[PDB]
Amino acid sequence: TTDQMEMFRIPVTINAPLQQQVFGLRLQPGLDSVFKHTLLGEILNYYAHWSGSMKLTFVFCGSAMATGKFLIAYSPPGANPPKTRKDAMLGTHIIWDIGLQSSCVLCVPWISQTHYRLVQQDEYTSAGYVTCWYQTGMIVPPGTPNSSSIMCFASACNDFSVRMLRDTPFISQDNKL
C-alpha cells in the first residue's frame, strides 16, 4: 500500500470468476493487525480478558446502478480455515443483497468453551475466521466504472465486557520528554 488510505477499501470487479473469495481474516480483535488499532481494539488492549458477541457491518460504496450479492460466513475454530465457498457456507453466514439499503450487519455469536477469552490469544483460545465470497457477482450497465469498493465497521454488542486491567503495549518511550 503506497497510499495509506487504500487500507480501508476492499476491491470488487465485474466479470469475476465464479465463487471467488473477497477477503479473509482471523478473529483476534486485540491481537490481529486488522483489529489492532480500531476503536474497539484500542479499548481491549487495556485489558486481558474479553467476552461477548461482535458486529461487523459492511457498506457498498459502488454506483447506484450496480448490483450484486455476497456471502459472508463466520467459521468457528477448527483444524483448517475454509478454502472454497462450499466449505464456508456450512458455518454461520448471511446472504447479503445490495439494493436501496446499502448496509448489512453480520452478528458474530459468542461460541466458546470458556466464559472468557484472552486478549493475547493463542491456540487454546482461538476464535475462528471470517470470510466473504461472491454469491452471484457484480453486474453493471453501460457507462459505469468497472470497479467498486466496500468498507467494514466493527463494534461490540450489548453483552460485551472486559476484565483485568493491564497496561497497553502500543506506546513506549526511551527518555524523559
Partner 1 sequence: GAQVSTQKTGAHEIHYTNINYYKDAASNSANRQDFTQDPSKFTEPVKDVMIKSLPAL
Partner 2 sequence: GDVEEAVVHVADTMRSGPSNSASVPALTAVETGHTSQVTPSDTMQTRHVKNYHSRSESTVENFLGRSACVYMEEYKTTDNDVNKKFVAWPINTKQMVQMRRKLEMFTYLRFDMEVTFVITSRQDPGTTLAQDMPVLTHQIMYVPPGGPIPAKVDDYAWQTSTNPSIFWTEGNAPARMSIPFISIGNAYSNFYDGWSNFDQRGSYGYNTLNNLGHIYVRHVSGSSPHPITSTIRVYFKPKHTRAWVPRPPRLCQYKKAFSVDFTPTPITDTRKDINTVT
Partner 3 sequence: SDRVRSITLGNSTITTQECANVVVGYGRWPTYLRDDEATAEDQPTQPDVATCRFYTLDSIKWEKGSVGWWWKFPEALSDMGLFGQNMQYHYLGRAGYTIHVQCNASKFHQGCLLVVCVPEAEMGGAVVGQAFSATAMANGDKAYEFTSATQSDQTKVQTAIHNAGMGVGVGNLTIYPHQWINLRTNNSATIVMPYINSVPMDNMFRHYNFTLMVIPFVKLDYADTASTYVPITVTVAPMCAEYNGLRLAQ
Q: Is 7 in the site for partner 1 (CB under 8 A)?
A: no
Is the separation of the CB atoms in 135 and 71 below 8 Å? yes
Stretch that binds partner 2, among 63-71, 111-119, 141-149 (CB under 8 A): 111-119
Shortest distance, CB of residue 86 to partner 3, whole angstroms?
Answer: 9
Number of helices (H), then strands (E), in the chain: 3, 11
Can you tell me which of 57, 67, 135, 144 binds partner 2, judged by CB under 8 A?
A: 57
Q: Is 148 in the site for partner 2 (CB under 8 A)?
A: no
Q: Please, which residues have CB within 8 angstroms of residue 92's CB and are 6 or more apart in sequence? A: 73, 74, 75, 76, 108, 109
Task: Tell me, by CB under 8 A, how many residues bind partner 1.
Answer: 3
C-alpha 28/C-alpha 37 separation (Å) is 12
CA 135, distance to chain mean position in Å, is 17
Give me 161's grid cell: 465486557
Q: Return the one option of partner 1, partner 3, partner 2, none that residue 146 interacts with (CB less than 5 to 8 A, by type).
A: partner 3
Stretch that binds partner 1, among 65-73, 100-108, 126-134, 162-170 (CB under 8 A): 100-108
Q: Is 100 in the site for partner 1 (CB under 8 A)?
A: yes
